[PDB]
């Protein structure tokens, strides 16, 4: 992504919302922005909470969703305007109805403008709507998994990444991350039990993408080997990028 220190940037907390849907996306000294989201098929609903941390009412409180270029087609967001007046210590909510059209990489931008004490306040933060949010976990026996694993022919559909662990390589947290990521977590597939296997279908209006994944941790070297095999090259690429940043 962008170069430079990611503190006070539009994406300080973005990565914390890839494998979970709830939490505080952003908070400065006047406003706290929280999220709660739910997904099903190629659709989702994201609640955005605007908490006024001051004792002063905000005015002309205007949050707007912006989807840059390709995203303008791959994702369709619909939402209702929010009450422009926000009491001190109060919270206003915004429900965003999400429709995934095709697989995507970019993230929508949430721009918030309001008046506080007669001054212009302007905030811009990346919204955590990611491709993996449209997963349907698909449980299956190991023989069925290998059968599908070996049906991949297009080399562009396989994407591998060997990278350095960015966080302690804790077994239980790893499991919770894969599950939160979206695919089914399949033990009993890789003969090596310390490895992790996932399977699921990514759902979009125009195409359903079957996805398989293998994560091989190397505890001594503090590294991981991640392999994505899916029915669409750009999905294998995007999912591999996303998941790799989580470990």
């Amino acid at each position: 992504g962008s170069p430079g220190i990611r503190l006070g940037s539009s994406e300080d907390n973005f990565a914390r919302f890839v494998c979970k849907n709830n939490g505080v996306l952003f908070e400065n000294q006047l406003l706290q922005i929280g999220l709660k989201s739910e997904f099903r098929q190629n659709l989702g609903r994201m609640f955005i909470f605007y908490g006024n941390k001051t004792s002063t009412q905000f005015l002309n409180f205007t949050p707007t969703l912006i989807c840059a270029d390709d995203l303008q087609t791959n994702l369709n967001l619909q939402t209702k305007p929010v009450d422009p007046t926000v009491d001190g210590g109060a919270q206003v909510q915004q429900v965003v109805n999400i429709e995934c059209i095709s697989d995507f990489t970019e993230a929508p931008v949430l721009n918030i403008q309001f008046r506080y004490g007669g001054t212009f306040q302007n905030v811009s933060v990346k919204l955590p709507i990611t491709l993996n949010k449209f997963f349907q976990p698909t449980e299956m026996a190991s023989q069925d998994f290998f059968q599908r694993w070996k049906q991949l022919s297009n080399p562009q559909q396989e994407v591998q990444n060997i990278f350095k662990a960015k966080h302690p390589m804790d077994t239980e947290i790893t499991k919770a991350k894969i599950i939160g990521f979206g695919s089914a977590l399949l033990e009993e597939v890789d003969p090596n039990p310390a490895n992790f296997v996932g399977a699921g279908i990514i759902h979009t209006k125009t195409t359903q993408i079957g996805c398989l994944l293998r994560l091989e941790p190397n505890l001594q070297a503090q590294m991981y080997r991640l392999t994505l095999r899916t029915s669409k090259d750009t999905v294998s690429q995007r999912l591999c990028e996303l998941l790799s940043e989580q470990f």
């Binding site: 290998f146 890789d190 003969p191 293998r214």
Partner: peptide
Amino acid sequence: SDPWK
């Protein structure tokens, strides 16, 4: 042996 390849 190794079903992975």
